[PDB]
Write a protein that binds this ligand. Structure first.
Ligand SMILES: Nc1c(C(=O)O)ncn1[C@@H]1O[C@H](COP(=O)(O)O)[C@@H](O)[C@H]1O
Ligand SMILES: Nc1c(C(=O)O)ncn1[C@@H]1O[C@H](COP(=O)(O)O)[C@@H](O)[C@H]1O
Ligand SMILES: Nc1c(C(=O)O)ncn1[C@@H]1O[C@H](COP(=O)(O)O)[C@@H](O)[C@H]1O
Ligand SMILES: Nc1c(C(=O)O)ncn1[C@@H]1O[C@H](COP(=O)(O)O)[C@@H](O)[C@H]1O
Ligand SMILES: Nc1c(C(=O)O)ncn1[C@@H]1O[C@H](COP(=O)(O)O)[C@@H](O)[C@H]1O
Ligand SMILES: Nc1c(C(=O)O)ncn1[C@@H]1O[C@H](COP(=O)(O)O)[C@@H](O)[C@H]1O
Ligand SMILES: Nc1c(C(=O)O)ncn1[C@@H]1O[C@H](COP(=O)(O)O)[C@@H](O)[C@H]1O
Ligand SMILES: Nc1c(C(=O)O)ncn1[C@@H]1O[C@H](COP(=O)(O)O)[C@@H](O)[C@H]1O
Lengths: 162, 162, 162, 162, 162, 162, 162, 162
């Protein structure tokens, strides 16, 4: 039973969003992946957002580049937490993606993560921390993961070559 | 028969969008004004956009501030030309409004005008020039208007006080 | 039992963060408010973050202006979801607050909301949607709230004065 | 009879503007292409703009990079709708192109599209939607095109490799 | 015989451009002031630029705000040195004025000064230094002026109140 | 007798500044080239600026990247017109170069040209137009050059391949 | 014996730089204040920088707004540590001040603090920490100060009114 | 006895921070290098900062990219001068690194250097100038170094190829 959905406005966003999925694979969290566009498939987005709850999703991670409307439009149609991932656009290096996602006016929110791939991974981690709140097992895996990332740095203090 | 519609995401946008309407009043162009929000009234926006053509609109002028989704969402649902007006937001002085409107990816366009009030007036003028293409009378009024703005500057070359 | 904590780097941030609390009051969600600074009270922040879970918090909302370190430092010390609120700084109008919060590298996330007051309210709404996932009652209040914001716009389509 | 003109300040802009023309080819819309510069061929621009109407153009698409003056200067000389396309400049990645085109003060407008190639295609699509208003056939082709772009996404929901 | 001309796109620019004129008054340099707009009075601008040399102007100072086209259009039509002054716009605080003036592509230049009033004064000073090259008297006044500005600072080293 | 000097803060700036010199070669204008740094050779800069007039220079073109101090420091020490050329820096793509050059406060000016190579060529053209004011021959060559750049565009209107 | 000097390009900078001095007063650190401009008093700056060491200064704090050259020019002439303070400019809100100070190329550094007043205070604190390295007494006062700022926050955790 | 410490948030920062170390090697200044992350190794950072003084460090140079918290967190925990180095991030080219480091509010400072490698070298030079204050020998080496960089430019005035 997938409790988290990863959507994006175009398959060209997959080079970025694959990092969110990679986190779910490492953490063994079931997840659904799909290309949904508020701009190119407006009706499927509405349909998708309206059935998000009945489908069992507790968190939705939406990525888009440029004038990103996907995240906000999904949020406007559901009470399921939506996390936004700014994909790096060619011309404005994701700054346009960032502003169009994070600058939501009062009433409909979207938790936004960093521009690009680091944000893809983080949105998955954030979604995982949200679920772990009521899943002791995942919570344990999440703590194992953090343990690993920390010790990796600790056991490798000197950046210089031997 | 109103051939142009002026929508905005919030009545707080009216302080800006009133300048678009002022142009239509001066040019005697019938127009419809309404607050439609892709974020707060998503279903009314869909309904609105889908019936835009059958309603007789040939141009739509949409204004929004911050992460502006209104313009793009309307454009995604209709073939009626959509002109975007970036409303000046408090924190980013409309830069977030501008990027979220103008940076549309390939497939669904939005002709964007200047940030703020000057853009409101211009979107109305642009819409008027679009209609004048098949309305000799309005075309004449538009030329009278341009004549007036030009001569006003011409007959007042010295900015200094007498 | 407060399941959500609202922290900020300075009481000068309260003029902004009060809007997050206002949402919790309207939605009748118990909440804890406190001024914690990663910069001025580093030890209390560590202590605070480390005991967040044992204290019962399921979401933490942290606001800061300028070079905002509070959100990221709390996130680095706990698995409790952290939502960041960029407070509007004088010189860079919150852009420095925004970048220092949202641009977290891979490993420790922070769901970021809009700059300023609109972001304060939204972070509370987002936190509320996170909790509502396992609280049918709050979920109902959240839907009542959205219903109200939508109908308010619907029953007031003409921005012009009567 | 070409009802739409595509101009640009330099043939170096063609790598970008070719995408506008590609749309007209797909949609079978007659079009004129020409390099006109307000900066390097000021007199030909005036001559060009002044005869735009008598030449039968109903829409003009102008692309320029850097301090783009072409779009605004054409608009100042004709009532024919002008759509601006910000070409990506080396140093400012088209941000200078964008501001010099979209930030027109009150009186002479220019509908601006996205920076770069996506904007080139969109300006053509926008111009096509303007013409389709009084051309049922093109309107039909435009709807066929949108149908195709939408179903392409719909019939390919999973971005992952088989 | 006025050897320097001060033009601007609108009399609303005078609040800024008056500082350029103030320099000429202090330095006793004859000068012509006039509101010329490439956008609102395109033909008068052409006429103006084409006759600049025969009129005796050796330097032209042009100020404009927003998408400033005035400076570049004048430069495109004459060999008389053109200095640009970015007027502070409301929304983008003159950044749009700055980019549209300074970012001229190869072939037609415009020496650009600071945004706002400080730039107005400086463009006049720069123009004065250009003329002083072949005017020993003005050159002397210019050196007297610099002497005065320097000693004013020198004879007042402590910013604190007595 | 070289009437114009081209200086730069580092020989790494030559890849850019060579375009200014190329203009002088085409226009047959004697010129001096030299690497002077306000930061690395402060005393030689002072010495250089103070003797600029006695050396016969009527215009100085200074290029620098990053926090560019060269142009302003030269201007502070001489009455000889100084034109600034923002060299494209790695991190901020010349935006830091641009602001540190153009944003001079009241009293000491610097005519600034576009970021990068296009600005290098233009500063040379601008300097040439300044000299041509009292050199009919160069003025003629300058007009021949403009004639050539214009006709090149005119005789090549179609950007498409034959 | 003043071991730290506070300079600024104009007495108009005092409204900002007074906060640096306020720190020295609280910490009882002798200090010299003076208006020195690289742009308006270039020779006094050279003289000043060259004698900084023989005068006993161990740290220099320089503030400037707009295209700030003061900090860098002082650093180029002395080995005494120079700390830069970006004064908030009207048009670019200190962003131009910031880039012109912090973006120093390799060879001559300037430790830069925050834009505006907070940066003024911090540069003084940083200078104080530099001196405290070889002054146990000041080091003690610095620790008393930090103690006070921390406990002030600690003993006032609830931002709300009683 | 190493009197200066060079830390960074990740070994991926070494490609940049190696330039700081290179300066210490040339100047023969003992130094400690280590990867410390406020985000990934929060406890080791605290431990590290708290023992900085007892370890003999008189200056700390911290580099980080993106939302850089390392510098500020170290500064919050020690009185040892901290110099920040903005590492160039992929998406925002170090602008996010710069703002998150330099924009520290009143109370805890961080002397910030240029974005990237030039800043790495400079922070080392600045730290060296701080130490040289009480080390005549290093002070001499520092002056030898500056002598060399200056004469290198002086003895190579013509950037052109022989
Ligand atoms: N911004 C959106 C939306 C939306 O907001 O609905 N749909 C697609 N996109 C973005 O368009 C960019 C280019 O897409 P293509 O590569 O298909 O041209 C992608 O980054 C996508 O996320
Ligand atoms: N961006 C949008 C949308 C939308 O994109 O659908 N709906 C409203 N808004 C913007 O929210 C801002 C603040 O609105 P309120 O004053 O009601 O808080 C307005 O500028 C509106 O255009
Ligand atoms: N950025 C931080 C941190 C932190 O990151 O720990 N602590 C306080 N601050 C910010 O300092 C700004 C000015 O605070 P003061 O008004 O006390 O000078 C506030 O916006 C606070 O959030
Ligand atoms: N901005 C303008 C204008 C104009 O505004 O009239 N004419 C040319 N350009 C731009 O100059 C850039 C470089 O042109 P070149 O490659 O010929 O140097 C192009 O992007 C063109 O659009
Ligand atoms: N940018 C230009 C041009 C031009 O480029 O020709 N003409 C006027 N303007 C600018 O329009 C702004 C607002 O003018 P108004 O106050 O008349 O609305 C002014 O800053 C003017 O310089
Ligand atoms: N900004 C200045 C100054 C100055 O302002 O005096 N001197 C050199 N520079 C710039 O340093 C950059 C890197 O120089 P290097 O390649 O030698 O590291 C160049 O763009 C130069 O113009
Ligand atoms: N940037 C510099 C320099 C310099 O760099 O030498 N000298 C003065 N200034 C700045 O000019 C601004 C306006 O000064 P005025 O108020 O006298 O016009 C101030 O912020 C000063 O620091
Ligand atoms: N900003 C910080 C912090 C911190 O602030 O504690 N720790 C690491 N980082 C930055 O993360 C970026 C990417 O690191 P990785 O290459 O490991 O993904 C680096 O620039 C590091 O300085």
């Amino acid at each position: 039973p997938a409790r988290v959905a990863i959507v994006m406005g175009s398959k060209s966003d997959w080079a970025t969003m694959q990092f969110a999925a990679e986190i779910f694979e490492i953490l063994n969290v079931p997840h659904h992946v799909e290309v949904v566009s508020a701009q190119r498939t407006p009706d499927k987005l509405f349909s998708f957002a309206e059935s998000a709850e009945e489908n069992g999703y507790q968190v939705i991670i939406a990525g888009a580049g440029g004038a990103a409307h996907l995240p906000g439009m999904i949020a406007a149609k559901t009470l399921v937490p939506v996390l936004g991932v700014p994909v790096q656009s060619a011309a404005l290096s994701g700054v346009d993606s960032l502003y169009s996602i994070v600058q939501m006016p009062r009433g409909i929110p979207v938790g936004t993560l960093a521009i690009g791939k680091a944000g893809a991974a983080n949105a998955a981690l954030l979604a995982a921390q949200i679920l772990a709140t009521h899943d002791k097992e995942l919570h344990q895996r999440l703590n194992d993961w953090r343990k690993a990332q920390t010790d990796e740095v600790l056991e490798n203090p000197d950046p210089r070559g031997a």
